[PDB]
Structures are given as C-alpha cells and as structure tokens.
C-alpha cells in the first residue's frame, strides 16, 4: 500500500474507487499499484 | 470460597522432599453467616460473615439483635463475601478452615502495618540527593513541577502517613490446613500486624 | 416584559414578534410594561388584545 497525497492509476488495470470517504487505487494485476490517499 | 482469620505469625515448614518454605499461620475460629443478601432485597448477592466472638459487655443492643438471627455471640469482625453460591449458605451456618485444602491457591487481604508520618524516600522509594560534595539536599521529595502551570500537578507524591492500607496478595498457596486448631498455613508472608484481621478467598485469577 | 409577553402570546397561539406586528397594524400603542402587567394579572384583557392583533394580521 502506497499512502500518498497524489494517487493515480499506474496501468490500464488500475481502478480508482472511494472507500469510507478515502480515494483509493486498486489493481488486480500489480499489487504494487495499490494506493490510498493520505 | 472464603474465610476470615487472624494473623498469628510466621514460621517455616519442611515440605515433602525436605524443601523449607516460610508460612504464615492464620487462625480462623469457625466463622458464622450472619446475613444473606440477595438481588431481591439488596440488589446484589453476598453473604455476611462474622468472626471472633466478642464479649457481651463490648456489644450493643443493635449488634446483638443483628446476630440474633444467626443465634451466636456478638462477632468482632463482619465482612461480606461475594461470588459465592448463596444456595449453599444460610444464616447461622458455620464456615471452617476445612473449606480450603492444602495446595489451594488463594488471595489474602489484610491491612498493612502502619508506619505513621513518613518522608518521600521511605514512603515512595524515591532517590536521595548526594550526601556530600556540598549537597544540602538529602531526603527531600524533588521538584514540585514545571513553572508554566503556576501550580503543582495532582499526585506529586510527598511525605505523609504511610501504611494502614488494604492490600491483597494474590496467588498464595495453602500449605496446610489444621481443622482441630482452626489454622491455615499459607506459603509466604501476608500484609498486617499480628492479631489483625485477614481475609482468605479463592484466587480470582485462577 | 418582552419575555413575559412572549409566553402569554404563545399561550394565545402567537409569537411575541407576530403579536407586536399585529398590534402595530391595529394601531395599539399599549407599551410592553402594560402588556406584561395584563398578561400576568388580566389574562382576559391580554387575550382580547391578542385577538385584535391576529385579526389585523389576517387582514
């Protein structure tokens, strides 16, 4: 999990979502792309 | 399980295998259940237990009336035991040391010996100041706090009356039980001066 | 006086502000001291005043 202010998709598989009011990026392909805004 | 007794003193016992262990001798003349408290009448469950029969001239009409239900002489000590099975106790019932068996694990409650007015060094185990090198600070309680609050924070520990506190020692071992002499030998040492009241209960942690 | 008048007006189905606006519309000049006195002592008189105030508001 990368916790950073700027969360953006890193590859075509990355999907941007919001959980509990927080922006998050989830990638089924590369777990390195998992990001949370914080 | 629980009982009330008096701290007779300390000695030592040789266990099987010849190990030598210090024991506290606590006498408990059979206690008597003086009153049974219930949710219906008092809102909580407990049994009131009296111990150490008292001379009549030392008792009061209200106290004599209170113990009349149990049909016994006035008792010097009275205490409530909780976490017991009320169904097994009834007013006038006796409790003897045999309630415990050797090797039982118990909690022992007493009132610690009083030391009177004591300084911070003894009372709270604080460090002295240097005794030489020009020091004029030997047995004093340290700084009272920082400047900013313009006050002293609560719990800044200082000199005062030491001892006389209710202390419970946990997980003591019932080394032996002598029903004939109404004695319980408990491994270790327990709070309180000789002839003071002692409360034995089945260890809650167990 | 304003607080007491407000309580009385609420009991008569009105707020203090609406009562005073209605009284001004109806040309009533009775001041707050007299109004508070009526509310505490002459409830019927205060109710009559409130009725005229409400009628003026309706008109």
């Amino acid at each position: 999990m990368k916790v950073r202010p700027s969360v953006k998709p890193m590859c075509e598989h990355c999907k941007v979502i919001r959980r509990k009011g927080r922006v998050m990026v989830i990638c089924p392909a590369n777990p390195k792309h998992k990001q949370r805004q914080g | 399980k629980g009982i009330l007794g008096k701290k007779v003193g300390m000695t030592q016992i040789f266990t099987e295998s010849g190990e030598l262990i210090p024991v506290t001798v606590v006498e408990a003349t059979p206690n008597v259940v003086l009153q049974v408290k219930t949710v219906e009448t008092d809102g909580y469950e407990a049994i009131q237990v009296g111990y150490q029969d008292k001379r009549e001239v030392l008792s009061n009409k209200p106290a004599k009336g209170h113990v009349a239900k149990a049909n016994t002489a006035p008792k010097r000590f009275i205490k409530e035991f909780k976490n017991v099975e009320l169904g097994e106790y009834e007013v006038g019932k006796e409790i003897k040391v045999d309630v415990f068996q050797a090797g039982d694990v118990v909690d022992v409650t007493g009132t610690t010996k009083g030391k009177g007015f004591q300084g911070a060094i003894k009372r709270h185990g604080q460090s002295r100041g240097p005794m030489s090198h020009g020091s004029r600070y030997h047995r004093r309680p340290g700084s009272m706090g920082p400047v900013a609050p313009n006050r002293v924070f609560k719990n800044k520990r200082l000199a005062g009356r030491m001892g006389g506190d209710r202390v419970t020692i946990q997980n003591l071992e019932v080394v032996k039980v002598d029903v004939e002499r109404n004695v319980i030998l408990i491994k270790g040492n327990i709070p309180g001066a000789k002839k003071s009241l002692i409360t034995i209960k089945s260890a809650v942690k167990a | 006086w304003i607080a007491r008048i407000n309580a009385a007006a609420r009991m008569n189905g009105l707020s203090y502000s609406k009562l005073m606006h209605g009284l001004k519309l109806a040309e009533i000049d009775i001041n707050r001291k007299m109004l508070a006195d009526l509310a505490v002592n002459d409830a019927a008189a205060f109710t009559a005043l409130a009725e005229q105030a409400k009628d003026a508001l309706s008109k």
Binding site: - | - | A7, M11, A39, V40, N41
Partner: protein, 147 residues
C-alpha cells in the same frame, strides 16, 4: 411606578410534564425542555426566582442523533490529574447511560448558577416508556410543533 410583577418562591404552582424523546433530535428536545424547566413558557417568569415546571423525559434511549453524531460526537471530561482525560461517544452514552446523555445536554442549556442547578434537579430522564412519578399526575407535553 415600579409596579412590575415579581413572582415569589412557593406562590407559583409547578406542574409536571411528560416528554417523549422518541426520534427527537437530542438538542431540540433539550432546548424545549430547558425553556420549560426555566419557566420561559409561563407569563409569571421571574429571572431571580424559580418558576418552571417539572419535566419527565421518557424513551431517552430512542433520542435521535443526526449525522454521524452517534460515533463522532465525543464527550470529554478531565479528572484533573495529569493526562486524566476521558472520552465517550454520544452513541455509547445513548446505549448504556441515556439519562446521562439527556442530563448533560440540558445542563449545558440551563444557567450556570445556583438557580440553574436547582432547576436542573427538576429534570427526570428515563430510557423506556415508564416512569415512577405517576403520583405527581404528570401530563403529556407534545413538542412536535415546539421543535
């Protein structure tokens, strides 16, 4: 002329009301309750004399907390010992000790003086719909339009 009426202690009759808190926002219930306890609803209101009526709040457990107040509104209290701060959420207070929830809300709204504390004593809060004060013959006080 100096004729303004001033109420006296004990001459004013204090009635008893029952207020149902079911699905009423905590603050709005408290505001109306505080006015009643102070006596702002009666023309005989006298600031330096207690003249308000008694309040019995029922169904305190069902008081309403809008928004996320159930978990985000925090009640703090300091024991006055260093680092002696304690907190409890409004939702937890409602579940476990709703009387405390309503009482704290109404204490905040009554005056902070001898008269205010005396008036606070006239409040009685009960989670649930039944109260032990039938002997006082309290009467229902609808607040649907008052909130």
């Amino acid at each position: 002329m100096r004729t303004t009426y001033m109420a006296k202690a004990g001459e004013v009759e204090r009635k008893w009301y029952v207020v149902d808190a079911t699905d009423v926002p905590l603050g709005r219930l408290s505001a109306v309750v505080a006015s009643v306890l102070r006596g702002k609803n009666k023309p005989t209101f006298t600031p330096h004399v207690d003249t308000g009526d008694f309040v019995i709040v029922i169904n305190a457990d069902k008081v309403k907390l809008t928004g996320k107040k159930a978990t985000d509104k925090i009640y703090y209290r300091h024991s006055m010992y260093p680092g002696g701060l304690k907190s409890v959420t409004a939702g937890e207070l409602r579940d476990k000790n709703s009387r405390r929830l309503i009482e704290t809300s109404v204490k905040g709204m009554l005056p902070k003086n001898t008269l205010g504390r005396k008036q606070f004593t006239k409040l009685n809060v009960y989670g649930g719909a039944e109260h032990p004060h039938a002997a006082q013959q309290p009467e229902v006080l609808d607040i649907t339009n008052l909130i």
